[PDB]
Amino acid sequence: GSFTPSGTTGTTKLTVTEKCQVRVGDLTVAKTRGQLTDAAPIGPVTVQALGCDARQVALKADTDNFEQGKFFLISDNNRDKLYVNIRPTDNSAWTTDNGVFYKNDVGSWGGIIGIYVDGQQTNTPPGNYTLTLTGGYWA
Amino acid sequence: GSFTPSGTTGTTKLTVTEKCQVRVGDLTVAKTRGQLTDAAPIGPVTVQALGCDARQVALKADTDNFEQGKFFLISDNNRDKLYVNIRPTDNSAWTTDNGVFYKNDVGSWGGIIGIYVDGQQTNTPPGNYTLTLTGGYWA
Amino acid sequence: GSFTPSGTTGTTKLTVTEKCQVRVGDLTVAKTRGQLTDAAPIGPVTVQALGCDARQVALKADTDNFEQGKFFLISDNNRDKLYVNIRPTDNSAWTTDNGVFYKNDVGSWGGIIGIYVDGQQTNTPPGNYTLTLTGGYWA
Ligand SMILES: O=C(O)CCC(=O)OC[C@@H](NC(=O)C(Cl)Cl)[C@H](O)c1ccc([N+](=O)[O-])cc1
Ligand SMILES: O=C(O)CCC(=O)OC[C@@H](NC(=O)C(Cl)Cl)[C@H](O)c1ccc([N+](=O)[O-])cc1
Ligand SMILES: O=C(O)CCC(=O)OC[C@@H](NC(=O)C(Cl)Cl)[C@H](O)c1ccc([N+](=O)[O-])cc1
């Protein structure tokens, strides 16, 4: 049961605002707190594995993005959490183990991992939220 | 008289150089210190508000970018200032209040905010300068 | 013998992985440690000088990227080095002096600087490696 970092990093960012929302500069992913309903999509994460025919593809969340079997985006100040579910768009089987989301079967998997709001969190404080996922393999 | 953060962040960057200027890597906004003449344009900042029919759109500068009713880009080391004026390209009326630039009338305004050199500053030390503006609303 | 910073910054990034490599998110430059063979190209660095007819174009590496006449990409944690050679793709003559790579002749040079693995380093620890180069001039 261990993760070996071996791959690149994907960063999922979301800015939460109030109903009166002021977008400054280039387009980024932003939602009102009212839009943070259960199962609301936050964004996709592409995964492309190579040379993993005999290993289980895995993604490890940054330390600040997990606790107690749960994943969450975290505010810039490290204070506020936005709980999420992480799920492949296909029908593949994965397991969660202490910040690690790994594939049940070996193979050089390619696919999309979706990040979804876990439980309505319409009271989330406005701010910039991040989830960082690093590629590697589990055993 | 208070700002509520509610929106995204726009970052205005400028690299100041000497006459002999060496651009490394991708194109970025760069000027010689000799080009930092009064009213010289540094760049535009897009603003798009939504759901603000009953609020005054506002932009708040990072703490390190204002003092004494004045705005400035700040060097990477926090030491050197480049004083600027912030002005909408249209004929709309705005007010400055302690790092906050807010619109006089309520409404979901969309427009361009220009950043301009305030007073000739042709002796500015070469370096990378930044101005950070966060969207929200004032009352 | 001194460098005057005057220009922009180019950042060369490389993620080193094991054979089982998991790419997460957008495409970035990544190699297996087995690919870090001698003279292996890491990437190009564009250089465009202006107003340097009477100066020697120069690039200075960040402090953490050089020591003892040698250049290296450095890991995120500052611990691990990946030694490189820096060489213009054309036939121009340059000199290295304590973290500074400068052109022997004056002139507003434009060209490509290649970054290459210096000596096989197939045991490099997986991680994210960076080399930062700032433009300016030498005398
Ligand atoms: O994406 C966001 O920024 C917010 C969520 C969204 O787009 O709503 C719905 C959306 N789904 C997702 O973002 C899920 Cl989280 Cl993967 C959409 O159906 C979609 C986008 C991208 C891809 N893809 O690249 O394969 C598949 C499906
Ligand atoms: O922009 C820079 O990088 C330097 C300033 C400049 O472009 O000089 C002149 C320029 N103006 C500005 O940058 C002002 Cl600061 Cl908005 C130009 O007229 C312009 C650019 C973009 C837009 N727009 O997007 O609507 C309107 C006008
Ligand atoms: O580049 C990488 O990401 C890895 C190295 C590579 O591309 O292998 C080979 C490659 N060379 C380089 O990257 C050297 Cl380090 Cl400049 C290629 O021949 C090339 C790329 C770009 C340019 N250019 O912009 O002028 C010239 C030549």
Author numbering:
A (entry chain A), B (entry chain A), C (entry chain A): 0 to 138
What does the paper say about this structure?
The aliphatic ‘tail’ and the nitro-benzene ‘head’ group were traced within this electron density. Positional and temperature (B) factor refinement confirmed that CLS was present in the binding site at full occupancy, with an average B factor of 32 Å2. With each conformer set to an occupancy of 30%, the B factors refined to an average value of 49 Å2 for the succinate atoms, compared with an average value of 40 Å2 for the rest of the small molecule. Overall, the CLS–DraE complex structures imply that (i) substitutions at the primary hydroxyl do not significantly affect the mode of CLM binding and (ii) the nitrobenzene group is not required to bind DraE. The CLS structure in space group P3 proves that substitutions at the primary hydroxyl 3-OH do not affect the mode of CLM binding to DraE. Therefore, we hoped that increased DraE specificity could be gained from substitution at the primary hydroxyl group; unfortunately, the CLS succinate in this study did not fit the surface with a single conformation and alternative substituents to the succinyl moiety will need exploring.
Dr adhesins are expressed on the surface of uropathogenic and diffusely adherent strains of Escherichia coli. The major adhesin subunit (DraE/AfaE) of these organelles mediates attachment of the bacterium to the surface of the host cell and possibly intracellular invasion through its recognition of the complement regulator decay-accelerating factor (DAF) and/or members of the carcinoembryonic antigen (CEA) family. The adhesin subunit of the Dr haemagglutinin, a Dr-family member, additionally binds type IV collagen and is inhibited in all its receptor interactions by the antibiotic chloram­phenicol (CLM).
